[PDB]
Design a protein around this ligand. Structure first.
Ligand code: JZ7
Length: 162
């Protein structure tokens, strides 16, 4: 198991534009296209992302290319985030994957909301962190995925993805 395999399980792979759990146009392996309700706007974003006129459909290789870019961007975003970087750097490799997963899904806008969870993670108070992480819109809206990610944060093992 590694971050790519983990996110591939959590995000799936679809080659046609679809709506994500939040109702937003997405393609590939969880590549968000836009929050616009206009499918044409999503198609424009797709064509821009791929560099050709796709009319809402891509290949597996193209999906994997977006996925590589998105994982890279998520990790690098963590390192550029003054709140996230020290916590991320404090973690072992498996728990780092949990952090990348959560950022991939949620982005960085809600970081301040996770101030207490982040502190508990940096303190290595794993059971306490796991309890706190579940007290969230994130958990309530995607509980099966959040349970897997939280188990990963709690244990530093891949048990939830076996
Ligand atoms: C989604 C970014 O906020 C943090 C990062 C990983 C752990 C808790 O939430």
């Amino acid at each position: 198991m590694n971050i790519f395999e983990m996110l591939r399980i959590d995000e799936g792979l679809r080659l046609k534009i679809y709506k994500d759990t939040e109702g937003y146009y997405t393609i590939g392996i969880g590549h968000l296209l836009t929050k616009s309700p206009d499918l044409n706007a999503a198609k424009s974003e797709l064509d821009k992302a791929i560099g050709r006129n796709c009319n809402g459909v891509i290949t597996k290789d193209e999906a994997e290319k977006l996925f590589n870019q998105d994982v890279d961007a998520a990790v690098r975003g963590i390192l550029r985030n003054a709140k996230l970087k020290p916590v991320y750097d404090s973690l072992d490799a498996v728990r780092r994957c949990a952090a990348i997963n959560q950022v991939f899904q949620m982005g960085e806008t809600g970081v301040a909301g996770f101030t207490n969870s982040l502190r508990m993670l940096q303190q290595k108070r794993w059971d306490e962190a796991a309890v706190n992480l579940a007290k969230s819109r994130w958990y309530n809206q995607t509980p099966d995925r959040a349970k897997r990610v939280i188990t990963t944060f709690r244990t530093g093992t891949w048990d939830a993805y076996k």
